[PDB]
Symmetry: C7
Subunit: 254 residues, 7 copies
């Protein structure tokens, strides 16, 4: 009879194998964490070391009860592949997560645009990243999607550039317009003077002459510099009698 002996041996092997798997796979895990390898990378790789051993164990254990060696590979292969398909997206997001943490194209707290979606990063989870839009919406984007696309970071550079486009009537003095605009941006102290300070006639529009003005400020200042400068342009041009034209039209009666 002595089938009983193989059946208990098969269980013994499974038990001994499961235990020797736990320890070898923790040993390797501590070893990589202590060598400053990423926690998730060390985790993922240790999990493989674990199941590699369970696999070898099942092969030997099922082997002793006559289950053939190719059959175990085939079956486990299928199982692995089934799990593989189910875990596929997550595995990809997992990896992206590691790379975002590892290379930090953005950091929690930075305003970014990830595929036409902008807001301030809260956190980068294992599989996805959370951000808060300027108006309090919480957006959750999968890590894989993020890393496949462009990452625009508004916060990384300390200094940024406003552009104004102002339209004035076709009969404005080009010199006066420029002078006034230049005075405005000269007197604004939040405008960096050691950088570009463009003030030019840019376009001959349908109903107006368009002047471009480009001026750098610190990120923090950018918003208010625009608003403040714009209000001055309004008041100054009104004072100087420079017209902001409405839509124009020549009409020919019959």
């Amino acid at each position: 009879l002595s089938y009983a002996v193989n059946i208990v041996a098969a269980l013994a092997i499974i038990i001994v194998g499961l235990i020797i798997a736990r320890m070898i796979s923790n040993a390797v895990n501590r070893l990589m964490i202590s060598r400053k390898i990423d926690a998730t990378v060390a985790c993922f790789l240790s999990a493989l070391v674990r199941y590699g051993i369970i696999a070898f164990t099942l092969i030997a254990a099922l082997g002793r009860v006559g289950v053939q060696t190719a059959s175990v590979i085939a079956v486990l292969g299928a199982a692995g592949l089934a799990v593989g398909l189910a875990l596929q997206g997550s595995l990809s997001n997992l990896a992206a997560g590691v790379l975002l943490v590892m290379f930090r194209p953005f950091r929690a707290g930075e305003y970014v645009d990830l595929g036409g979606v902008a807001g301030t990063v809260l956190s980068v989870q294992i599989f996805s990243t959370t951000m808060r839009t300027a108006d309090g919406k919480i957006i959750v984007i999968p890590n894989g999607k993020i890393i496949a696309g462009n990452i625009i970071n508004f916060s990384r550079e300390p200094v940024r550039r406003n552009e104004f486009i102002i339209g004035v009537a076709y009969d404005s003095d080009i010199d006066q317009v420029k002078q006034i605009l230049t005075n405005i941006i000269q007197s604004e102290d939040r405008i960096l003077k050691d950088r570009e300070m463009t003030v030019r006639l840019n376009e001959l529009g349908a109903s107006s002459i368009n002047f471009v003005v480009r001026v750098w400020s610190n990120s923090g200042d950018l918003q208010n510099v625009y608003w403040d400068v714009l209000e001055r342009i309004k008041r100054e041009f009104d004072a100087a009698g420079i017209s902001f034209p409405y839509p124009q039209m020549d009409v020919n009666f019959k």
Copy 2:
């Protein structure tokens, strides 16, 4: 002759194998559920443990009736692959379902936007999620599709931000306009005063000066704060003689 003995043995093995499969695969299932592993994950994995054993059983059983060991693998392989292709989408939705339950980017009852489709979540089924739009339509979105895309959640933050853009005639007093607007948002108690309260000249438009106003309120209040504040802006500006301009045009006459 004694082929009969292999044929009965083959059946015996199938029967004994099917029974020993049931129990080993339930044992492992209860073990996972009791260790607080997800019900669907524990189910999926147990189903594999089950068929792994049926596979080993069929190999040994068909083996004893002379069907070769590689033939059984090939055939079962093909079958598995056939089923694999058919079950592929669902398997992916199944997994997404687990992750939505597990990480709860949204919860039943939250207003969300899943790929340009907005409404309040009813439930997250095994393969798909159901929501009701603001006007009573029921939308059913596959879980996989949801988790591949962005998940905008309107309900998660307690505090949210209205923006108003008001256009006034080019001859309005910038100071007056701002003052009035500021008085309106100061006197509204549903507007959080410890947060942003922006009131600025924002744009020199074709026919109007455009002021932006940005003010935070609780999610619940957001809708009505907008409506209420807007109606006041109208009445106040009308009282103060601030003009909401119609489209403008300078026309220069001639005769042919």
Copy 3:
């Protein structure tokens, strides 16, 4: 080789055995694969799922049979697997789309996101479901067109169901001249929706100034009715708004423009 006929009829026996095996195998395949099919159908498993799975049980046995049968005429065991493998794969590619539609068909039947007779929108295509066939779903548009959409395509996308909820919501946006009394406009609109008995009064009844438009003030009105009523409530309420505002001297403004002569 006239005289060398001991090893001749010797082959004949394998050739007949090979046929015998094919025949016996084909018969034992039919029965085992029907037995399994009845077993599933009787255990309340879907007819198509039970069919699909039984078909596999069938060909698995024909495969084993061909291997053994071709085997006894010397065709090697790996060759039969390779060849059948290729054949299977060829059929596999040809049947791929259908297999996917087949599965979607099962799931639409099984979970019924929609039911025959419901107005639905499947990927920007709306109409009333007629049936869900094995591979595709048929619907009739509001104007009598028959659209046939593959099941797989349906289940991959969103399914908007107009019919599932018993109660639905109309939105009206009405534009009135900038000199209208905000209070009067609201009052009139509120009277209209109060007096409409098909408008559910225990639900939202919004009437608000919504937008300061280029040429008009825009009021939003939002009011729930039963699905069946929704269409006619809109039409009826809209006609009243027209007649009432006209009576009250509330102007629906045309496009506006201030023109400055030069």
Copy 4:
């Protein structure tokens, strides 16, 4: 090796046997694969399905034949599988699109979402179906263009069929000036569609104020007719709406604008 000719003609026998096997195999392939083909066609299985499946039965046998034939000249059994495998795979890739179109062709014939002669819209392309070939479908547009669409592309997408239903629905949207009598407008329109005998009276006959437009009030009119009638019912009804409204002094407004002068 002049004298060493015992082992020479010894190879000749395998070489002729190899050819004999190829020949016998090719012949036994032809017949077995025709036998199966007639069997399917006679059992009312599709001609193309029966063809495709028979072609596999054929080459399966040629494959077994080549293995045994090349085998008897020492070419090893795994080598033949590998080589034929590659060849098969090469052909596989080249034939892939067609194989998919072939299958779609079968399904279009088999389920007939459309039939030759029906006006259909296949992925934003409309016209009257001429035929469904093995790999693609041909249609003629309303203005005489011939479009050829691959079968696979057709079956992956929506199939809108204009011809399947016998009865279809016109919608008219008519804009009248803001000072029109809502009752009069409706009455006139209703009279027009009542007196049109090609408009089915047992079905919807909607005539409603639908939209308050920028320059006009818009009335919707919806009325069912037989497919054949649909075109002319629209034209005929529209012309009447014009003449009737003109007679009744109901104005079709031009674009409107209030203009406020200054200097």
Copy 5:
């Protein structure tokens, strides 16, 4: 020592195999071309018959110098796969080329639209098709791309259909307008009279009443029938005092 004998045998086998490959693969090629099988199909399939034999030869030849039988399959497999990837697009274009030749959805000289690109087909090469646009641009489209998409053929039907849409002022006589238009298309002999001849009030536009006119002519005539008919519509309506309205607008003053 006698390794030298295996090494020469290995070369002998390679040489004998290469020669027996050439002939068997030409024999098969002539057999197919003579049985009216496509030149490219017969070529492609013969090339496989060739390398199948070189493969068997290398296996046996490398075998007699001790290189194991699975190793040769693995290595050649890899090589084949490397070439496979590089040749993948072309193989697909090759096949499309065959099918375009074989089924001729279009023929050289026909005006066609292949995926929103129109012009007159010059030729269908092995991998791609060349056409000349109406204004002398040469477009080269890959065969695979062509066969995956729609093929609109303007030249296949002998008879085609013009549509005119004419806008007239809201005060035009519907009967007069129709009559005039009908007279114009009746008197045009290049307009097929046994086919559709639609002349109807089609649309109540913002500034005009729009009449549709639909009339069939031969492909060759279509262009000039349109131009000629259009000029007559202009002259006739002007003569009859039917107005082609400019953009309209009702303006309501104040100040």
Copy 6:
């Protein structure tokens, strides 16, 4: 002990194999280049012949130190596959490069449009093609991308066709307009007279009658013929009192 002998033999085999690989793979390379096979094709294929031999060498060499024959295949397989994935895009661009050189849908110096990007081709590198836009931008497009899409060639045909669309007021004499336009294109010698010379009333527009004019010139002339002809149309119509209408509108007053 005599493990040392296998270890040195293993190295000997690697060395002998590497050397016999170099020569066999150069021999094949010269053979192809001398038979007028493309330099890149001959290169790619020779590289395979090389590594095939290194593979056989490693199998035999690692074999003699006890590393099993299936293990070497598996490992090298994986390595090959790793390199395969990394080299995949380039391999595809490589092949496209060959085909663009080989079939020359365009040639350096031709103005072409490759997927909505136009300019003059500078060169076709191994993996990508460089062009200069009309305004001095250098665009670099991967070869694979190019060959997958349409290739519009402006330079290939020697003769090309201008189309002018001119709008004149609704009260213009159709005959006069045509006559003037015809005189203009008759007197232009850079307009080929043995080809199409269309001058027709084409469209009844909202504010104007639109005449189409279509006339062929040599590629080189096309640009300036358009400019020159257009300026004449302006001066001639002004002289003849033919009006280029501004936007039109009928306005109906109320109070």
Copy 7:
């Protein structure tokens, strides 16, 4: 306790298995560094030499594990299967990065752009800062930092604004329908003749280009050095304005002929 002949008997294969792993790991280190130095010294790219050396390393660890696990009875096909799966798992996870890695090499190797050049990579323009292992960083004209994956970059078009030393401005000027075509051209030609930053040995187009709805449109095309392009446009444009105003050439507003009626 007594059955200890076959007990310590296993211990030897277990220590041998470890010995093999250790000896294999060490002989892997050196062989894979030896190959790495060999490539780097032969002027092979640092990343290519790295990637290939890493394969040489693990190939040896693989052979080592097979032999080591082999001596403790773990069968030779099992080790291949298991390592295969592991490799494949890692393969999938590393797939995107592997593709970006390769693109990184090719961008460095062929330099379609160089740090400091203004480029447009898939409708995104700015000046390149650096090309990292997996991605490229650029700064937009207004101070935004964009990070684009290398693979995405090489799959698409690369427009380089900085590579050519000479570039071409186009001006389109609209003048009233009653302007003298000759005068307009003459003035424009004088402007571009007198601008010294405009290359005179190259195209200098000034033509009537379009008969627009409300204006005649003249095109002007003129080459300058990359550095000059911006300011040449601005300067030339301002002159066109002042000159035309002086010469009484009108920049027309939108035009319309209006035909009055009196409804009743």
